[PDB]
Every structure is written in C-alpha cells, then in structure tokens.
Amino acid sequence: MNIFEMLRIDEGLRLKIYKDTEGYYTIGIGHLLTKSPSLNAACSELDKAIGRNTNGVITKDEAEKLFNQDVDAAVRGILRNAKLKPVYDSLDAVRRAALINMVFQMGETGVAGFTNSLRMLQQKRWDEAAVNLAKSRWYNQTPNRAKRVITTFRTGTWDAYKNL
Ligand SMILES: *SC1=NC(C)(C)N(O)C1(C)C
Numbered sequence: 001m002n003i004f005e006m007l008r009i010d011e012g013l014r015l016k017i018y019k020d021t022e023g024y025y026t027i028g029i030g031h032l033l034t035k036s037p038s039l040n041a042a043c044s045e046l047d048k049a050i051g052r053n054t055n056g057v058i059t060k061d062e063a064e065k066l067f068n069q070d071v072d073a074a075v076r077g078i079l080r081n082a083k084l085k086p087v088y089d090s091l092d093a094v095r096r097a098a099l100i101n102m103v104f105q106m107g108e109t110g111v112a113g114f115t116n117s118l119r120m121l122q123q124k125r126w127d128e129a130a131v132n133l134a135k136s137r138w139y140n141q142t143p144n145r146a147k148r149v150i151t152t153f154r155t156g157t158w159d160a161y162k163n164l
C-alpha cells in the first residue's frame with residue numbers, strides 16, 4: 001500500500017465525466033473538474049486539462065496522468081501551507097498518506113482549518129485526534145472513507161485498506 005493505491009481505492013476509476021459525492025463534475029481517479037453546474041464548463045475544463053478535444057471520455061493512461069499531477073499538487077499544497085507543513089513533517093510515512101488523502105479530497109485551505117485535529121496529530125495523541133476528526137462535516141458526509149482515513153491516523157498502519 002501507498003498513497004496512490006490508497007486514493008485509487010477511495011476515489012475509484014471512471015473514464016467518463018460523472019458527478020462526485022458532492023454533486024460536482026469529476027473524471028478519472030477523483031479529478032475534480034469544476035464546481036459549476038454547467039456540463040459545458042466541465043467539458044471545457046477537461047479539454048484544457050488533457051490538451052485535446054475530448055468527448056467527455058478519456059483513456060486510462062490519461063486518467064493516471066491527471067492522478068499523478070493531483071497527488072503531486074496535494075503534496076505541494078501541504079508543503080506551502082504554514083499550518084499543514086509542520087504537521088506533515090512531524091508524521092511517519094503512513095500517516096503522511098492520510099493527510100495527503102484529506103487534502104486531495106477537501107483542498108489545502110479546508111484541511112488547514114482543522115486546527116484542533118492538527119494540534120492533536122502533532123502531539124501524537126492518536127485516539128483523541130481520531131475522536132476530534134469525526135466531529136466534522138467531512139465524516140458525516142463520507143463516513144466510510146473518513147473512517148478509513150481516521151483509522152490510518154489512529155494506528156499508523158494500512159489495516160483499513162488491506163482487504164480492499
Ligand atoms: S464533454 C461534453 N460537452 C457536452 C455538453 C456537449 N456534452 O454533452 C458532453 C459530451 C458531456
């Protein structure tokens with residue numbers, strides 16, 4: 001297991017434009033295209049991202065290319081953020097993947113707002129952090145995914161992704 005395999009489980013793989021859990025147009029392995037309700041806007045974002053006129057459908061190689069860029073962007077967002085970077089630096093590699101997962105799903109600004117959870121993670125108070133992380137819109141709206149990510153923070157193991 002690694003961050004790529006973890007996010008591939010959590011986001012799935014779909015080669016045609018679809019709507020994500022929040023109703024937003026998305027493609028590939030959780031590549032958000034736009035928050036606009038306009039399918040035409042989503043299609044224009046897709047063509048710009050891929051560099052060709054798509055019919056709303058991409059190949060698996062194209063999906064994996066966007067995915068690599070998106071994982072990279074999540075890491076860069078963590079490293080450039082004054083609240084996320086010290087927490088990331090304090091974590092082991094498994095828990096770092098858990099943080100990248102959150103940033104991939106919610107963005108740098110959203111995760112940086114989890115001030116109390118981030119403090120508990122920096123303190124390595126894993127059970128307390130797990131309780132605090134669940135008191136969130138994130139957990140209530142995507143509880144099975146959030147439970148997997150939280151278990152990863154709680155244990156520092158890949159147990160929540162093993163039989164998946
Ligand atoms: S991509 C795309 N743009 C329009 C609105 C024409 N679509 O119906 C697609 C094929 C999803």
Ligand SMILES: [Cl-]
Nearest residue numbers: 048049066069
């Ligand atoms: Cl892009």
Ligand SMILES: [Cl-]
Nearest residue numbers: 090091122124
């Ligand atoms: Cl330490």
Ligand SMILES: [Cl-]
Nearest residue numbers: 128131132135
């Ligand atoms: Cl709490």
Ligand SMILES: [K+]
Nearest residue numbers: 011012020030
């Ligand atoms: K998804």
